[PDB]
Design a binder for this molecule. Structure first.
Ligand code: HEM
Ligand SMILES: N[C@@H](Cc1c[nH]c[nH+]1)C(=O)O
Length: 392
């Protein structure tokens, strides 16, 4: 039994409130029970890094009861490493740079172009959501407005991958995936043809060459590009935008020198993380210092609690793109499951923000309307703003 804490479901106009809450809780106890979120939360750095590394004690098996069964995240040990190698190939530095020139740079120019002719826009819906959606489109050879229509189902899918102790959340997730399976099957069938010229077509050929091209594997490839490449990446872009908007002098520096964008992106992941960490299944009784966890417990590794550890990052409430070494990205997880798509997400954030800042030198937040930040923004599983109104 752990002390109670209320870390997740608390709204604030301060983007730092989430990180500050987690840090303040971590100073008081290593492990807390977040009643509204509904599970124990590991907050102490030593416990978290141990958990990420000891996959035999802290597994991803809970994923086998839900729509990710048969995907990469649900695999363990040797099965996992072999398929992981195959996913890794499509996010290598060279591959990502081809995506940048062919797909993401031009698309970014087009998304930013359609914001002009409006004195004010919501950069959340019109930019952070729109750009990753359209990238996943071009990787599929498939229209982005068709993905736009899956939004309620995409977030329904994701919510059942987080609050897995909730039977209703899990069942709605399975339902939403079932309602998306026709579309998934359409994309797979079309891009499995020799006539296929898309990246997704490249991917399905590689799976076949390793004799891994089951219906299930091909569906989970597509599913992860939707859940990760579209919805999750959106909140990274959105939180990076906000951090700059909320720091006009830094925004100006970054516009004048775009080579600062990677640091701005990493610092934004520290200062305003869009994800908290990961979920794990405790597979055997384990003692963490004087804490005990029972086998069968699903826990949250809230690695972003270290984002506000002032011993690592002094004045952690300050957005400082000049921190060196750059803060460790905890929003991508840890250990062998560490996000394989991270290189694409980082590149989309850099290229999109570069086009946005170059096209609108006068860009600024709407002074009256402050965003509200919370975990679960617009029914997502991200910590992010409810809106990003700007003046162009
Ligand atoms: C801002 C963007 C993203 C964030 C914050 C993020 C976060 C994460 C995290 C924390 C994990 C680990 C889950 C766990 O260990 O339980 C993960 C895994 C994964 N993510 Fe990402 N992700 C992002 C974008 C993407 C993209 C763009 C893709 C693919 C195009 C993607 C695909 C995957 C896959 C396939 C895995 C499973 C990896 C494995 O188990 O080996 N994600 N992601
Ligand atoms: N949660 C979904 C989508 C996602 C990918 N990366 C981060 N999130 C999954 O684990 O695939």
């Amino acid at each position: 039994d752990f002390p109670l804490a209320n870390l997740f479901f608390v709204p604030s106009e301060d983007a730092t409130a989430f990180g500050r809450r987690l840090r303040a809780a971590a100073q008081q106890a290593p492990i807390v029970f977040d009643t509204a979120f509904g599970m124990p939360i590991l907050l102490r750095k030593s416990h978290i890094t141990t958990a990420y590394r000891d996959t035999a004690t802290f597994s991803t098996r809970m994923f086998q009861a839900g729509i990710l069964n048969g995907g990469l995240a649900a695999m363990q040990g040797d099965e996992h490493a072999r398929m992981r190698r195959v996913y890794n190939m499509f996010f290598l530095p060279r591959a990502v740079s081809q995506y940048e020139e062919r797909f993401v740079r031009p698309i970014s120019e087009q998304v930013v172009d359609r914001l002009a002719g409006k004195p004010r826009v919501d950069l959340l819906e019109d930019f952070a959501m729109e750009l990753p959606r359209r990238v996943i489109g071009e990787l599929f050879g498939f229209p982005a407005e068709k993905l736009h229509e899956t939004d309620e189902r995409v977030r329904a899918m994701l919510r059942g991958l987080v609050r897995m102790h909730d039977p209703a959340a899990v069942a709605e997730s399975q339902r939403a995936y079932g309602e998306t399976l026709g579309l998934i099957t359409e994309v797979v069938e079309r891009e499995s043809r020799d006539t296929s010229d898309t990246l997704l077509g490249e991917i399905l050929r590689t799976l076949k060459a390793e004799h891994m091209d089951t219906i299930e594997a091909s569906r989970q490839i597509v599913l992860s590009l939707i859940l990760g490449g579209y919805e999750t990446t959106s909140w990274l872009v959105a939180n990076t935008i906000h951090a700059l908007l909320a720091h006009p002098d830094t925004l100006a520096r970054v516009r004048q020198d775009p080579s600062l964008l990677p640091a701005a992106i990493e610092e934004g992941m520290r200062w305003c993380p869009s994800n908290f960490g990961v979920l794990r299944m405790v597979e055997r009784d384990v003692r963490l210092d004087d804490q005990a966890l029972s086998a069968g417990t699903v826990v949250c590794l809230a690695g972003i609690a270290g984002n506000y550890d002032e011993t690592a990052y002094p004045s952690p409430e300050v957005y400082d793109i000049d921190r060196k070494p750059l803060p460790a990205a905890n929003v991508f997880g840890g250990g062998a499951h560490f996000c394989v798509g991270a290189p694409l997400a980082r590149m989309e954030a850099r290229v999109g923000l570069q086009a946005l800042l170059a096209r609108f030198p006068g860009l600024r937040a709407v002074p009256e309307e402050r965003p509200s930040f919370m975990y679960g923004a617009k029914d997502s599983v991200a910590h992010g703003p409810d809106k990003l109104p700007v003046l162009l």
